Amino acid sequence: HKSARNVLENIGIKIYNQEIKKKNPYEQQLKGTLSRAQFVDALSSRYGYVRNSDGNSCNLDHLFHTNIKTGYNEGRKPCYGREQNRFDENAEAYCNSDKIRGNENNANGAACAPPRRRHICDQNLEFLDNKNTNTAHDLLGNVLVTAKYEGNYIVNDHPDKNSNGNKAGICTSLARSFADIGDIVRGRDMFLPNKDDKVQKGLQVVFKKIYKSLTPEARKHYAHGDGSGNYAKLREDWWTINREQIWKALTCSAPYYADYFRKGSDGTLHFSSHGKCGHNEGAPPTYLDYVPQFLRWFEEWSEEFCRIKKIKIDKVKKECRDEQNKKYCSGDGHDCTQTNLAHNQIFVDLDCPRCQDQCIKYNEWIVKKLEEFYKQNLKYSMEIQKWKKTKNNYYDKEFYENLDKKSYSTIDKFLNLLNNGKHCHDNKDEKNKIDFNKPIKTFSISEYCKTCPLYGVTCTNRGICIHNSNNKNKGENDLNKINIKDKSPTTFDVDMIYLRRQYMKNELKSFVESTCLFKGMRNQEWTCQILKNLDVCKLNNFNKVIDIDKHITFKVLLERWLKDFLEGYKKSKRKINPCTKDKNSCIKLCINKCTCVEEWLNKKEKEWGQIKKHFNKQFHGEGYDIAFKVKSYFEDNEADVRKSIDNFHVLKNKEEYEICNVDDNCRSQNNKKKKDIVTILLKELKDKIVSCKNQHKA
Ligand SMILES: [Mg+2]
Ligand SMILES: [Mg+2]
């Protein structure tokens, strides 16, 4: 049981000491002399100068140690983009195919470019192809400016920045930037921000010139059997020589009390004594620049997930569970502390809606996070298999080999190290214990986002709230007693969207099936019945692991269904859109689309029939009918509603009356009751399928 960073470092040294075992004969041709660097910006060119640095990397200024001759950056800043807050809880990683090398749509496995990498300080490196950049020295000073300013940003933005304890976290983030800078220099970096590829294109042009500048012996050595230059080899070395200098400009801003720590294969403690992340100590305390990018990134992803999850949960606790301050709420937004409870009062607006707002958000993050953990898990397998399979060579092989030689042969053994990370391990509560080998619990929706205990809670002076049993029994029950038209139960099954199915798949398979329209559908068999003055719904097929609550109110259920309907309606309108396009364009694949929609459409039509069947078992007062409940919900949720529906405003004020059914509520003297938004939305969507069905027919 060791940390993933400690292990990846231990493997890294074995690679580093292998590089320095051999004494480079051409070392002096690749070692850069800072003082010797030549830079020319727009003003420098205007005024007719060539700026040089002094000895100190710590006295480097972007206004003079840059080649930036562009219009956009007149300030000549190394950080010029969305490089504002990388440690933000809402800062996103990138896992798609377009902006990553090796990540391709087809293969489900993908590496995740952390926010910190996405916004590195290399805008000055986009300027490397020019008449003044032709030496090992020039290049170093460019890497040196980048390292300084990037190292600055990390220190003046870090969460541990003001921390009372040890500032170890700052060094760790620098080590991450250092390694990423290295992979950039080397040509090894996988992030492709734009097809322009200016750092990499320029970085090529520099090394081509460095190569010609070399001696015949050195040129012959850094060459390919065909005579061509082994630019790859040239570049990995240039990094090994210069890396000490790159670590100085980086740690140039690091605080006195920040020290890079790491443990040995045995368990020996390695620390940077002098301080400032080992700034005045020479040789770097890190070997992370000798760890493949993917692993560094995965270890970063895990460590940031664990960190932000603590922030996210705390924001959820703030709106849903602060018993010390008489706070207790449902994820369906109801104050459980209340004497007279809003959760069984169907027409009543919701008290505590900030809780529901927090839960929806938290859930959406945890599922974004889950998708990333799935993608990376698959790539770790793709990479750990690749080493045994391929006979030929690539730079990473040697590392992945060693990893398999340690117990970390498979994903499960490695995910154990991810659990042991500084942030992931730090939990004195087994409620929020992180086990990446238990994706179910670790990617679960918070326990604070559960429905109110049906009877409510009564808070105490002691700083906690207690679950009351059969609370306020028959108190003001005389009023709703006459409003009970049917006390029999009503059973129906509902097709809830469970998108956590693409990932987790082996664990879910049994309970969640993928539909045509969704990569996950959860069939919930409900029994709704009026007991006392509260209509409770029981989940027949209840599974704690996958379903949140066993018992809910009918009001809670309706709104869940209504949330789900809109979502599904949106998805449907989306999948049917190319076929619906007015132009009489024949498409074969369109037939299977409309059939899919009809599959979901019909299910819901059948679903709602049963839900109205339960609604009508109670009287809420004339005009306080389901058509009005549907409007009330759609009004109070105008954001979501506008994203799903085409013209809500015309629908909201649409008066269509239908046959008055068996529905006890219909007390209208032979008059026909008005169609609800749900029924009109379905019956409208239907006509759209009927059109498509006959617009792609043989
Ligand atoms: Mg690609
Ligand atoms: Mg299926």
Residue numbers in the entry: 19 to 716
Give passages from the manuscript.
We determined the crystal structure of the double domain Head protein, the first structure of a multiple domain segment of PfEMP1, which reveals numerous interactions between the DBL1α1 and CIDRγ domains, and shows specific structural features of the CIDRγ class that differ from the published CIDRα class. The Head crystallised only in the presence of heparin, as found earlier for DBL1α1, with the best crystals diffracting to 2.8 Å resolution. The overall shape of the Head is rather compact, with the CIDR1γ domain folding back upon the DBL1α1 domain, thus burying a significant surface at the interface. The interface between the DBL1α1 and CIDR1γ domains is stabilised by several charged interactions (D367-D654, N381-R518, E389-Y521, Y437-K550) and, furthermore, a significant hydrophobic surface on DBL1α1 is buried within this interface. In CIDR1γ-VarO, this region (residues 496–570) contains a twisted antiparallel β-sheet composed of four strands (β1-4) as well as three short α-helices (H-2, 310H1, H-1), forming an N-terminal subdomain. All Cys residues are engaged in disulfide bridges except one free Cys (C604, canonical Cys(5) of CIDR1γ). Importantly, we clarified the structure of the NTS-DBL1α1 hinge region that was lacking in our previous structural analysis of the DBL1α1-VarO domain. We show that this region is surface-exposed and critical for RBC binding. Computer docking and site-directed mutagenesis localized a blood group A binding site in a restricted area situated at the interface of subdomain1 and subdomain 2 in the vicinity of the NTS-DBL1α1 hinge region. Importantly, the blood group A binding site and the major heparin-binding site that we mapped previouslyare distant from each other on the surface, indeed on opposite sides of the molecule.
Rosetting, the capacity of infected red blood cells (RBCs) to bind uninfected RBCs, is a Plasmodium falciparum virulence factor. Rosetting is caused by a sub-group of PfEMP1 adhesins encoded by the large var gene family. The extracellular region of PfEMP1 comprises multiple adhesion domains called Duffy Binding-Like (DBL) and Cysteine-Rich Interdomain Region (CIDR). Nevertheless, the rosette-forming PfEMP1 adhesins described so far, namely IT4/R29, Palo Alto 89F5 VarO, 3D7/PF13_0003 and IT4/var60, belong to a specific sub-group called groupA/UpsA var genes and, interestingly, all four present a specific DBL1α1-CIDR1γ double domain Head region.
